[PDB]
């Protein structure tokens, strides 16, 4: 199952100035780019068109091409309706659908960072917790059935006829396996007489990876997973362990990943390899983090 996300960010500075940029993610792979400077939607993968013909695509691109202008020009009128709301304003649209032959499509809209409006059923909707000054704007937008129609088309039927196309298209790219590379280091802990043992993992795909510090068969419970970090399209992760200075020895960073095939990267703290590498990377230590 893969969540297909259409992300649009629109910034209005004042009466005159406004810009809109958009990105498209399948799973966690960028497939489409659209710049306020650019006139046509850019492909970012050699399969981002999906199982759609040029005619099917040009018509859809045109559909959004008209939308971009229309959207900008609508908002700045909605502002004119409201002394109520003031510039500068930040519009964030989050469309898409998750594929399970079952799908759940969604269209969420966020105002100034807070999510306030969504599309539901056959119209736009305010949420629970939303402010009441967003009501008249909704009543104005729900008057247009013609738009409300064309949205439902894309949500109810078009997205999955498209997404199921992409999955089938980029099967080889989405299934690509990458070997993680790993190394160790240490930093003085925020505590007295302690040491944090960084273990680095870099360059793997897909995302799900397993890292644990070990004393043989024993999993070290103070192992702290980092947050995944992006690199191209690969993944970076680090797993820390706080140790009482003098316990460094006998430990090991173990990395399990689908691309290894039951043959894990195992890094022993204080092995000839660790000694040799940690030397290859010495430095003056200014400016280190406080």
């Amino acid at each position, epitope marked *: 199952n893969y969540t297909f996300r259409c992300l649009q960010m629109s910034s209005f500075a004042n009466r005159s100035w406004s810009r809109t940029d958009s990105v498209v993610w399948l799973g966690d792979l960028q497939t489409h780019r659209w710049s306020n400077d650019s006139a046509t939607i850019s492909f970012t993968k050699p399969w981002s068109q999906g199982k759609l013909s040029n005619q099917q695509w040009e018509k859809l691109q045109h559909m959004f091409q008209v939308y971009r202008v229309s959207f900008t020009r609508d908002i700045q009128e909605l502002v*004119k*309706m409201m002394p109520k709301e003031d510039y500068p304003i930040e519009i964030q649209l989050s469309a898409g659908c998750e594929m399970y032959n079952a799908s759940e499509s969604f269209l969420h809209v966020a105002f100034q960072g807070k999510y306030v409006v969504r599309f539901w059923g056959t119209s736009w909707q305010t949420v629970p917790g939303a402010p009441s000054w967003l009501d008249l704007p909704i009543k*104005v937008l729900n008057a247009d059935q013609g738009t409300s129609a064309t949205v439902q088309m894309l949500l109810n039927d078009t997205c999955p006829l498209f997404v199921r196309g992409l999955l089938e298209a980029g099967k080889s790219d989405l299934e690509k396996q990458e070997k993680p590379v790993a190394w160790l280091s240490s930093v003085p802990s925020s505590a007295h007489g302690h040491r944090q043992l960084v273990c680095h993992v870099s360059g793997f795909y897909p995302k799900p990876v397993w890292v644990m510090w070990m004393r043989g068969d024993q999993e070290q419970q103070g192992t702290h997973r980092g947050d995944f970090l992006p690199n191209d399209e690969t993944w970076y992760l680090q797993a820390t362990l706080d140790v009482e200075a003098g316990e460094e020895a006998g430990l090991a960073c173990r990395v399990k990943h689908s691309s290894l095939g039951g043959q894990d990267i195992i890094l022993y703290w204080g092995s000839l390899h660790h000694i040799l590498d940690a030397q290859k990377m010495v430095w003056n230590h200014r400016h280190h983090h406080h």
Partner: T-cell receptor
Framework: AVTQSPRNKVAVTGGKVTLSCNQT?????MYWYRQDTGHGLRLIHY???????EKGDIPDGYKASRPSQENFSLILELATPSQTSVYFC????????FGPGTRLTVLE | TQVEQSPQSLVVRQGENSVLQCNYS??????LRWFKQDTGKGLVSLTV?????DKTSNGRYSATLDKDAKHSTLHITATLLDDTATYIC????????????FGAGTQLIVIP
């Protein structure tokens, strides 16, 4: 129905002309237009509701004002010979309903 | 000009057909109203066309629309004298409370 007063007006260059417009159809959007030969109607000012004014396409020389929902006025601060035309007032909730039109002649 | 009307002036012998044209280059194009202006008076809405390819009738007036060409046409069958007016073609760009687009209109003179 939409009603405009005055219906006809002769004004002097640099004079202060005002064209009041009225409707009791309980609308919210009100528009001012200018008609000149070989042109078609052009928007001058418009209002999304009470206490609101918004510049249209040709707003230079004109000020709009809305004190109530029912009424919408257009002010020519310094009248110009270049502003001799027929002015229309419309309204909507879109189905725009138009008024009888005012003939304003501005002379030197 | 954003919206063009043909001809400038059509002249018909009372009690015959009369076709008036309208071409627009406006996007997006929600609908199209035809108006009727009695010389020295307001505008009166004859008919409206919303669909991609639309056809409609009202009295002797019957109008057509094809958005695949962004084009309109107004037919009046068996013209009366009291039809001598200007007919203006008006395009609506959004189906919500949007700015209308006005053609220069067509003055229709009917000879008896």
């Amino acid at each position: 129905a939409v009603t405009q007063s005055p219906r006809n007006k002769v004004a002097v260059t640099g004079g202060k002309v005002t064209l009041s417009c009225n409707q009791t159809n309980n609308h919210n959007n009100m528009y001012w237009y200018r008609q000149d030969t070989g042109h078609g109607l052009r928007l001058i000012h418009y209002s999304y509701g009470a206490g609101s004014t918004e510049k249209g396409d040709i707003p230079d020389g004109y000020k709009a004002s809305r004190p109530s929902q029912e009424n919408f006025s257009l002010i020519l601060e310094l009248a110009t010979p270049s502003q001799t035309s027929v002015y229309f007032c419309a309204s909507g909730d879109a189905e725009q309903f138009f008024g009888p039109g005012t003939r304003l002649t501005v002379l030197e | 000009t954003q919206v063009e009307q043909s001809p400038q002036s059509l002249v018909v012998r009372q009690g015959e057909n009369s076709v008036l044209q309208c071409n627009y280059s406006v996007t997006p194009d929600n609908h199209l109203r035809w108006f009727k202006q009695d010389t020295g008076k307001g505008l009166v809405s004859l008919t409206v066309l919303v669909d991609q390819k639309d056809k409609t009738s009202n009295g002797r007036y019957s109008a057509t629309l094809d958005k695949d060409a962004k084009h309109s046409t107004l037919h009046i069958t068996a013209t009366l004298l009291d039809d001598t007016a200007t007919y203006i073609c008006v395009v609506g760009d959004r189906g919500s409370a949007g700015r209308l687009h006005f053609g220069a209109g067509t003055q229709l003179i009917v000879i008896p």
